[PDB]
Symmetry: C2
Subunit: 195 residues, 2 copies
């Protein structure tokens, strides 16, 4: 009953944020566009930052799935995961739309403090997982001399983030389907001995 | 000549501080004028609109095309590495650069009202990418790429890494030290692209 109202609100906000930007989109405007009362929006989402965060959650992998996925070869699972993430830019319109909002249509003022904090936390976690993965004896032994797990996880994440950022800014740059393999290849070849 | 160039700088500094604190959307030209100790007409007079103002601000911090080319023209796969290394390291050594780029990647949303700024931003990136592509495409360099690494992919992989490092660090500066970690963050990309390295 209410879960249908929640989705309606988030879809409306998704469209508005995407067209107008987050700053220039109010909760009143979202309510109106969703065919709903202002009170109902405030009721379900409290404030704009929390709304924005719930929206992002529709598209983020929960911690339990990440861990389970990276637990034979973990260094190949990580590659696979990254490859699929890049490839998802094409195959998942919802993901594409929401991430273009995140990286292109919003500014992290005080009013979005909560959203930034939880965004940082999510990235921090992914980085910590990779760090831990690279830090295992089985994996660490395979890194090149002077590649530490700390640097490896950060180099990798930066690459993924950059690809997302570049492509969403300008989708002519590459094809997420057929170029993803080759865009990621050098990073993994540069980190790992055999590859 | 000079009289007005002083007024221009004052306006840009005011906007830099305001954009950084409030965000670009929530910063008006009226507010900039007031913070700069100047009339609203003078701002409009020097910069026309917010997007153009924002673009002039970024220009203070961008390498012109002629310097890029000159820098990448013995070993030039090395000059490119050096250039990237310095870019990452500049995050610490140049506060003005840091402030303005934090605005670009963190404190502004590319709506219609900033269409002009986005277009010229794209053009600048497009150019850097085209230069790298051309560099990797030279016989001297191309021969050194691994099997199935094309210049097109190489330039885009590299740029994405640089962009990502800037983005990550400016979002969370605890992640790494631009001074002492830059070498090691870039190392694998270059080792992965080039045979000998």
């Amino acid at each position: 009953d209410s879960e249908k109202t929640r989705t309606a609100i988030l879809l409306a906000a998704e469209e508005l944020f995407l067209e107008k930007g987050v700053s220039h989109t109010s909760l009143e405007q979202i309510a109106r566009a969703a065919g709903v009362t202002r009170g109902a929006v405030y009721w379900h989402f409290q404030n704009k930052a929390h709304l924005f965060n719930e929206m992002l959650n529709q598209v983020r992998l929960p911690p339990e799935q990440l861990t389970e996925r990276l637990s034979s070869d973990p260094l190949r699972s990580l590659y696979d995961l990254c490859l699929e993430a890049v490839q998802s830019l094409l195959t998942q319109e919802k993901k594409r739309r929401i991430l273009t909002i995140l990286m292109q249509r919003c500014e992290f003022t005080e009013e979005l403090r909560e959203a930034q904090e939880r965004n940082n936390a999510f990235v921090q976690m992914f980085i910590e997982l990779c760090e831990q993965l690279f830090a295992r004896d089985e994996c660490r032994v395979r890194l090149h001399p002077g590649m530490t797990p700390r640097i490896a996880s950060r180099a990798l994440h930066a690459l993924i983030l950059g690809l997302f950022n570049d492509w969403l800014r300008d989708p002519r740059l590459f094809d997420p389907d057929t170029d993803a393999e080759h865009l990621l290849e050098p990073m993994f070849r540069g980190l790992v001995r055999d590859w």
